[PDB]
Amino acid sequence: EGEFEKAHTDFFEAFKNYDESGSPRRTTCLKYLVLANMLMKSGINPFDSQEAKPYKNDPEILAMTNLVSAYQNNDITEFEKILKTNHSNIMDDPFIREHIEELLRNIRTQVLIKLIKPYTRIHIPFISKELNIDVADVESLLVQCIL
Amino acid sequence: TILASAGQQRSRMLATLFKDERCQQLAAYGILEKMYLDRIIRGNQLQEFAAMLMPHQKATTADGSSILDRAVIEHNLLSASKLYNNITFEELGALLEIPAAKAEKIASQMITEGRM
């Protein structure tokens, strides 16, 4: 089942508890620690806050480290570019199936909220260009946001 | 002063230079007068000022986007807000000498944060 708040809270503890004991799970733990701090749209960049400094960057997974940066900058282009280029390596994972649509829907919401600030009457096909979505998707997103 | 960054600090220096009279014989007075009094700087005046500039003063961050060229556009748009009650995109772009889409984008950027 997808409900993982219990593990979401426990991720911060397990970052240190099983660091030198859960060696087989260390490779997957460092990828998942980002998600827990990523879901609340807060926590700056976990790249260097805690003791994860020895790990820092890893050569095969680099866009994964910049994913949180793109999320913080609310730049849809960086997110889509990272997803298309590094596919099968950021997405490969299972636990990302349940959270990729959640992630790539709270960027579009903030982008759309900022976009409509100076306008009083806007064109839906114009919003369909900034957000890489069709008209039928932006209309549904607008309905959900307005509700 | 003209090349400096926007703010009230630079505004005080602009006022001080404007109060001087020895500045009337300089070649850049025609642009200081429009910069301090919130007027519209046309293309030719900016071209003359850039031609008379020194290479090291002509900063051009990132893709060209010369910083002076962006500041002059943002000043012309701010100054046109006192003469017009409502302006079309196709004629706000022809007043700032930019494409209409660029005019709309700059206007939205300035309206959003705090500048208009």
Added chain:
Amino acid sequence: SVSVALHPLVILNISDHWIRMRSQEGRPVQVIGALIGKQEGRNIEVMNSFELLSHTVEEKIIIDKEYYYTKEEQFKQVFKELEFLGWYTTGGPPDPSDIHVHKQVCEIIESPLFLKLNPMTKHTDLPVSVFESVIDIINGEATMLFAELTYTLATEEAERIGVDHVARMTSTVAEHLIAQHSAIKMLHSRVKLILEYVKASEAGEVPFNHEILREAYALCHCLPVLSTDKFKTDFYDQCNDVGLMAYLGTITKTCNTMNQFVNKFNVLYDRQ
């Protein structure tokens, strides 16, 4: 250059300062102060003022900087958005002593205003004059001179009401109509004088001045004041809103009279 919007509170402060200093010494003296207000671009608005302590050594007078810093620290607590603008004094035309003191003031603020109030004047206009410092190079040295500025009295309903009450010193509609009967009487006695001058120039009594007769033409052309179509919809909106409010007020008063009469009636003609 800049535009100055003076406040009558500053003038009252200066007058009270001078009267206090004269009454405590038996001889008029020259007083020094400081002005605080708000500046937005090229629109300076002088709002309040306070006193400053000055020491006169030999033949030169200086302003104690530590006292001014103490007063700035004190007043920043109360008024947060107000900032230092310049200084004021009492006297006639600007003097070398004033231009010497202006240098010390300018050492604190880049462009300080100068205000001079003449307590013993002989004209029929307000003796307040505003100057700003303009520096110049001449004869091989730098001389700093004073350029006069034009000021306008600022607007505020509370300040206007207080000023009117202070100036005057002694039915509710017969006391509101008099406050509007003393301002129209001042506009009429000026339009009449302008008309008399124009007729005198026509028939021939004073030299033909072109400038005055052009400004009079512009003044005549300025009427009516904003007779656009959108005006006579907001004006009527306001009139109808006040009319409805008055209608409800009369309905309430009639209901009160209703209740009074019914109570007085169910005493005499009561058979239960």
Added chain:
Amino acid sequence: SIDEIYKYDKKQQQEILAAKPWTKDHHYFKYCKISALALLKMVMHARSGGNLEVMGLMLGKVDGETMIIMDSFALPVEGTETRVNAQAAAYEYMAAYIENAKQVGRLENAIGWYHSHPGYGCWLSGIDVSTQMLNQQFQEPFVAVVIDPTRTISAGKVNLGAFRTYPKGYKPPDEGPSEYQTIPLNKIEDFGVHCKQYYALEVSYFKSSLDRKLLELLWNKYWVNTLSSSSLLTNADYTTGQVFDLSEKLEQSEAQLGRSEDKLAKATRDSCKTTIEAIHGLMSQVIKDKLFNQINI
């Protein structure tokens, strides 16, 4: 001889303070003279305070049975009308400002305190009454000044009041004229309980000889601001709160009618005042239209 009041006699003030006439009769102080500058400064500060309550201290002296006030300086305190003895929160400021003033010819001592009552009349509430009792106990002589800036703008007249409280345990004799004042419902109780413990002084204003000259010369460019100002657009939010309060007063009036003494007359008195102010706001605009928008060809 108008400026004679401006002279400060330290010896006479010391003698009067030492004598203390006021401790033998609780009804001693009857007059309150206020300078022009003090009134202007108080009104300006109260208006700048917005919809909150601002407080300050005012300087002066006593002469006979009259309380003379010459200057006032604002205090950097917030939250008045809810804390007893709020001025102590800036007591150090009291030391800093006054000690500065004595250097620049301001010799008069602290005489009273003032605060603003935006939109609900001039009187003393329970907290204000307690603060005035404390001040009279520890800082005699003293006087409390309450200002209403919103009603000053709305009614076109200065709304100010100077009050002094009665000592604890003293019974005030008669004195029940009770000139009517419109008090909001949410604060109607505080007026009722504390109404006999303080009495108001007779307020008058004075100005120096130079102030009169400057004020008569000032009424040459200041007549513009009279007939170029709109009163309807200024206090537009005041006569919506007033209408809400009136509509809520009519609730209690009708509830009593269905059965705290004759509330309908008081509700009618409030409605009449609000409507009179509204009509006064339109008469000036009609006059301005008759003067300026009717001179075409």
Added chain:
Amino acid sequence: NLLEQFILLAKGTSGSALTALISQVLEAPGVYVFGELLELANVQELAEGANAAYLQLLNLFAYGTYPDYIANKESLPELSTAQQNKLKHLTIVSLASRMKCIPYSVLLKDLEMRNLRELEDLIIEAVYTDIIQGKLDQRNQLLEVDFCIGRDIRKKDINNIVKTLHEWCDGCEAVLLGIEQQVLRANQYKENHNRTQQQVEAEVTNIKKTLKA
């Protein structure tokens, strides 16, 4: 101060030099009123001679508008670059003197312009000279004028000034009379109402007193 400088420079000049000074005055920026130059005897003396064209030009620049340089174009001398712009600015001032909301069509017709951009640029550069002050509305195609300078006057227009100032004086007097009448009526109403109330109270008191029998 420019016009008096030119007048002082033209104290004794006449003939070709005076015509050259007239042209320089018409071209000089900041000089938008020519009434003291017209009052000079030597300037008015140009009617008798071959230089009446320059006097006609000066009269046109003092009291005329740009359309008037549509029928006298053949007679008048050639107009320079800045002179046409100055005449267009004065035409804008003349239009704004009558109405305070000038439609774009009127400006396009009289100023002889074809584009909206050219017209708006001319209006903006006229505003920058501080001869008129206003705002441009483009949705409704209007120029809203808040202030404009007064152009030159003849000796036959002052009667109009007297006529339109008499109306203002009479209106102020009639407003004052009405205000005094309203004050009087209100005081009378208040006095009558309290006299009636006090009389009713006195009658009630008398009834109460006589009732003790």
